[PDB]
Structures are given as C-alpha cells and as structure tokens.
Design a protein around this ligand. Structure first.
Ligand SMILES: CC(C)C[C@H](NC(=O)[C@@H](O)[C@H](N)Cc1ccccc1)C(=O)O
Ligand SMILES: Oc1ccc(CCc2cc(O)cc(O)c2)cc1
Ligand SMILES: [Yb+3]
Ligand SMILES: [Yb+3]
Ligand SMILES: [Yb+3]
Ligand SMILES: [Zn+2]
Length: 607
C-alpha cells in the first residue's frame, strides 16, 4: 500500500493514459483545464474510485458525455483532499473508461513556482515551473498520485504567444490558440508509461541551443551560451549510460537550466532533465549532476520504486551508475574518491539525525510523514554503500554491472519493492548465494545508523585533502604563518571541496585560523557553488561576522535547498546573525518556492 496516496490503489484500478488540455494564466497564477484519465478497472463490479488532489478547484467530472457525482473529502494535511467519483455504470475487470475532470489549480500550488518578470533573467516576461516529485502532481491535476501506477500522456498547453511551453515529453508542434490569438498552443507526447511524479511543465521566455545529436539545452537567452559549454559532456555520458544500462528508450535527452529558485540540483523529468543554474561553475566540474539525472533514464524512470518507502532503489542505484559514468570518464581513482566522499556525507546525515533515528534506515515507513520533511542523503549514500559493498563482495565492478543491466531489463516499465530487488539479486547470483547469505540483510535494509560494513576505498585522491585538513585542525597560532597559496597548487576543485568538507566536519575552528585561510587561499573569490557553500558554512560556524552578508546573499540569491537550508540554519544558530536570518527569511518568504519556504520555516521555527 502507498501510504502517501489517498487514491484507489493499483489493485483496484489503474490509470493508463492522461490527456491534459490546459491554459496557463499568469494574471491569476492558475492552470485551468481538463485532465482526461483513461482508467482500467482491476476489479469486478467497480462503481467508484478515488483520486488524489491538493488545493484544486473541481468544476465538473464528465463520463460518457454526462456530468457525474463526485465528492471532495476533508483535507489530510500535506496529502491533500481525496476525490471520490461515482461511476455511472459498474465496470467489469479490465474494462477501460475515460473520465474528464474540469479543474483549476490554486496560486499556492505546492507543485508550482510562479515568477514575476523581476525574478527572471530577461526582466520582461514571467515564468512558471513545476516540481512534482514526490507527491505534488496532485497539486496540479487529479491523479492516482503514486509511483505504483504508470501511464502515458499527451498534452496541449495554451500560453501567452511570446512564451514557450516545454514538458517531460516529445515536442509535438505549436499553433496559434483558436480561442485567443494572443496565445499559442504547444503539444506534447509521452509514449513511454511513466509514474505521474515525472510529469513536468515549464513556461517562460526560453531559447535553445543544440549540444549533441539528441540534446538541446534550454534556458533564458542570457544563460544559453554558458549552459551549452557547462554541459557539453552530456552526449558522452549518454553513450556510457547506454553501454551500462541498455537502450535509451526516451528519444530526446534535453536539458533545462531553471532560474535560481529551482529547489534541487537536478530532476530526471523524462526527455527534459531540469537543473539548477548553480551548476554553472564555468569548468564543467559539477557535471556529475548530469551523469546522475541521465542515469535515472534507467534506474527510476524505467525501473521505478513502488512506494516512497523504497526510494533508495531509485536513488542508490542511480548514484551507483552516476559514479561509474564518472569513473569511465575520469578514471577508477576518481570513482573511489567520490564514493568515499559519499560515505562522508552519510556520516554527516547519521550524525545530524542521530544514530538510532528511523530515517537513517534504508527502508523507511513514511506513514503520516511528509516526504519533503523526511528527504535526506540517507537513501542515496546508504543505498550506494550497500551496492558498493555488494560489488566488492560478488567479484567486482564488471560482474556487478552485469547484474545492474539484467536488473534494468527485468524490471523495465514496472514499479517494484526492496524484496523484488533482493529476490532478483539472489536469482541473478544464484551461484553465489552462500556469499549473499553472509550479508546482514536486516541491518543494511531495516536498522538505523551507519551500515554494518564499510566498503574498501582507494585513497589516492583523498590523501592530500585529509593531510591539509589535519594540518589546519592541529595548527596553533604559531603554525598559521606556514600556510600559503601554494598549498592548493596540486588540488583539483573536487579536492578543494573535499578539503573543506573534511574541515567542516570538525567545525568550529578558531576564528584566527579561518581569517588566515581567507588570507592565504582567498576562498571568498571562488564562485563554484559547492566550494562556496562549504566555505561559508565553515565561516559562519566558526563565528566570523564578515561572512554573514556573504552567507545571507548566497542563501537568498539562489534557492537550491541543499545550500539555502543549511545556510539559513547556520545563520540562525549564530547569535550575531540570528535576528537577520529570520528577518531575511520573513522578507523573502512570499516570493520563495512553496516547498523551500515551508522547510526553511520549520528549520528556523518561524511562522
Ligand atoms: C547528483 C544527485 C545526488 C543530485 C540530486 N538530485 C537528485 O537526486 C534528483 O535525481 C532527484 N529527483 C531530486 C529529488 C528527489 C526527491 C524529490 C524531489 C526531487 C540533487 O542534489 O538535486
Ligand atoms: O521525495 C521523497 C521521497 C522519499 C523520501 C523518503 C526518503 C528517505 C529514505 C530513507 O531510507 C531514509 C531517509 O532519511 C529518507 C523523501 C522524499
Ligand atoms: Yb506529430
Ligand atoms: Yb528467491
Ligand atoms: Yb607551536
Ligand atoms: Zn536522483
């Protein structure tokens, strides 16, 4: 059972297709239109069914050309309001009908961010973008909002004619809107069955530049050139991903670089991955995020977690493939470096949560828990650690990539649980079952805390980071003189980032050490967002008042939650900046992304 959804489950009925016809009204900040669901009964004598909704206004529900009775249940917090529809004729098993629902969204849709012209690059036009994962699609349209159900879709979207609509689907043409010549209608087709969390829409002043045989980059005009360069390795990553996962089935792989308030580094919307402009480091150094979202084209979008309790299946396998792509491009030592960094992030998460916390388990129970609140690095890095351990247990990366490809083939177009995975693992490695029975399954899958076994990691690229961080940590006042810009001479941006991650784990350091570090390394000049993030964190946690405006500026001028949440939390923890931190949140709150606003508020214990 999907405890995050109020809709009829897949055992009762299944949505096969959605046809969406809607109009984007920037004046009212509403999407208005009709969602036509092709629904297949899985039961004999089926007479009603229930859909998820959230802050939607339902005008009517039409079946066989007649309006039918429906009822909106009481709101259940972040789950929204269940919508029961009374079918006019009882359905037999496997019978399909079409239900057309006329609806309109709320300007406060938690799926959507509506941006004024000032919040964009061009300053002339507004902009809208969606973010449905995990359970926000119900805030756009009535659906069975669960990844246990996969459906194809088509859509016709009317927007002001000077703007462009894109969706997680193949572009199917554009025309003037017959009902309003100030508007265009953009059409879309997604022929591959997907979970509804993968439905996505952007509307804005978008331009495109081709960067590979199946990839355009889309953004506002002022970011197109830089994005084309930043993401030029995209085709080479697709090719390696295909080698590891099997055929890329989705047609196009385009990229959309969103405005800075986009709450995530990336989102694997099929045919059109969304990314944060905070990837635009200028040197392609943050391109692992592209490798990662590309990997979802197999692990997540093709093989999908059946409920959100099993999210690690999505994320852990994806981080596993991500790291192989980057290992192919840059070497096995680099794969190990990033693998070990991830174990470090898992250390941080488990320390933050506490080693007995329920959300340090690999498989969790999200009953009564808002997924946006439970979200962390655990499913990512504890999932990846399990896979990496198993790789090492079962004979190495070549052997384990064999399993990964077979696993993708086996479960393509399906939604599965941890036991499905484990079951196939045992079937695939049936000649190594005695070895598999040596794994402590209950601990890995179901216990809180760090995993029972740490994998083995090559240290080559990590050693210099640890060495420098330990120099700083053990330095006394009289040792500060020995530090110099030449310390960084042979470190890549990745190593500079890991140096800062190591040092941040021991924060605070003495204020004089941090001032010296700015003195000799000039980290204030680094605009790499990962590096700047950790640096400002280290500065604020070490109580350097100079870094306060820098941390505030970064927290507000972009809204990637990975950066914005810990910066606000750090600033609220520092007595000198606490009052400014809450005031600044209060001031920005109305124009923030709705999920980010909610989480930062809880973080800060404000409103
Ligand atoms: C390299 C990755 C770890 C980057 C990471 N992005 C992802 O994991 C995306 O694939 C996720 N789909 C982001 C996400 C997860 C849950 C709910 C909403 C959005 C991110 O930081 O955004
Ligand atoms: O969008 C989503 C989807 C799933 C979740 C739940 C993710 C999770 C899994 C886990 O094993 C441990 C966690 O601490 C958190 C959170 C957000
Ligand atoms: Yb066509
Ligand atoms: Yb079995
Ligand atoms: Yb000394
Ligand atoms: Zn992911």
């Amino acid at each position: 059972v999907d405890t995050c959804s109020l809709a009829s489950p897949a055992s009762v009925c299944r949505t096969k297709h959605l046809h969406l016809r809607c109009s984007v009204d920037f004046t009212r900040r509403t999407l208005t239109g009709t969602a036509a669901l092709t629904v297949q009964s899985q039961e004999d004598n089926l007479r009603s069914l229930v859909l998820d909704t959230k802050d939607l206004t339902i005008e009517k529900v039409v079946i066989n050309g007649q309006e039918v009775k429906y009822a909106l249940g009481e709101r259940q917090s972040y789950k929204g309001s269940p919508m029961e529809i009374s079918l006019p004729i009882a359905l037999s098993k496997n019978q399909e009908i079409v239900i057309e629902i006329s609806f309109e969204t709320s300007p406060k849709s938690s799926a959507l961010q509506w941006l004024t012209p000032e919040q964009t690059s061009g300053k002339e036009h507004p902009y809208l973008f969606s973010q449905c994962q995990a359970i926000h699609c119900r805030a756009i349209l009535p659906c069975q909002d669960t990844p246990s159900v996969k459906l194809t879709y088509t859509a016709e979207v009317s927007v002001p004619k000077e703007l462009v609509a894109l969706m997680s689907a193949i572009r199917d043409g554009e025309t003037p809107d017959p009902e309003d010549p100030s508007r265009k209608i953009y059409k879309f087709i997604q022929k591959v069955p997907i979970p509804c969390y993968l439905i996505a829409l952007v509307v804005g002043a978008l331009e495109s530049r081709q960067i590979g045989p199946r990839t355009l980059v889309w953004s506002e005009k002022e970011q197109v050139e830089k994005s084309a360069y930043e993401f030029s390795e995209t085709e080479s990553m697709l090719k390696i991903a295909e080698d590891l996962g099997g055929p890329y089935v989705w047609g196009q792989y385009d990229l959309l670089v969103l405005p800075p308030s986009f709450p995530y580094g990336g989102m694997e919307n099929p045919c059109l991955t969304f990314v944060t402009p905070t990837l635009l480091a200028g040197d392609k150094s943050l391109s692992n995020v592209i490798a990662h979202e590309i990997s979802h084209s197999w692990t997540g979008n093709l093989v999908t977690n059946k409920t959100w309790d099993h999210f690690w299946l999505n994320e852990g396998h994806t981080v596993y493939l991500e790291r192989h792509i980057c290992g192919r491009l840059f070497g096995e030592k680099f794969r190990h470096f990033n693998a070990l960094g991830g174990w470090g992030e898992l250390q941080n998460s488990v320390k933050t949560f506490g080693e007995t916390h329920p959300f340090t388990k690999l498989v969790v129970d999200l009953t009564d828990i808002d997924p946006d609140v439970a979200y962390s690095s655990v499913p990512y890095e504890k999932g990846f650690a399990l896979l990496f351990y198993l790789e090492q247990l079962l004979g190495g990366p070549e052997i384990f990539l064999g399993f990964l490809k077979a696993y993708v083939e086996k479960f393509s177009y399906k939604s599965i649980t941890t036991d499905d995975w484990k079951d196939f693992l045992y079937s695939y490695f049936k000649d190594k079952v005695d070895v598999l029975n040596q794994v402590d399954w209950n601990a890995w899958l179901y216990s809180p805390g760090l995993p029972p076994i740490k994998p083995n990691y090559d240290m080559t690229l990590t050693n210099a980071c640890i060495a420098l961080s330990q120099r700083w940590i053990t330095a006394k006042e009289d040792d500060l003189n020995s530090f110099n810009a030449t310390d960084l001479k042979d470190l890549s941006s990745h190593q500079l980032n890991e140096f800062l991650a190591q040092t941040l784990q021991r924060a605070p350091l003495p204020l004089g050490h941090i001032k010296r570090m700015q003195e000799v390394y000039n980290f204030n000049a680094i605009n790499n967002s990962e590096i700047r993030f950790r640096w400002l964190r280290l500065c604020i946690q070490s109580k350097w008042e100079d870094a306060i405006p820098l941390a505030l500026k970064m927290a507000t001028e972009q809204g990637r939650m990975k950066f914005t949440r810990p910066l606000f939390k750090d600033l609220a923890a520092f007595d000198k900046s606490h009052d400014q931190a809450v005031r600044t949140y209060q001031e920005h709150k109305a124009s923030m992304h709705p999920v980010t606003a909610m989480l930062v508020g809880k973080d800060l214990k404000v409103d």
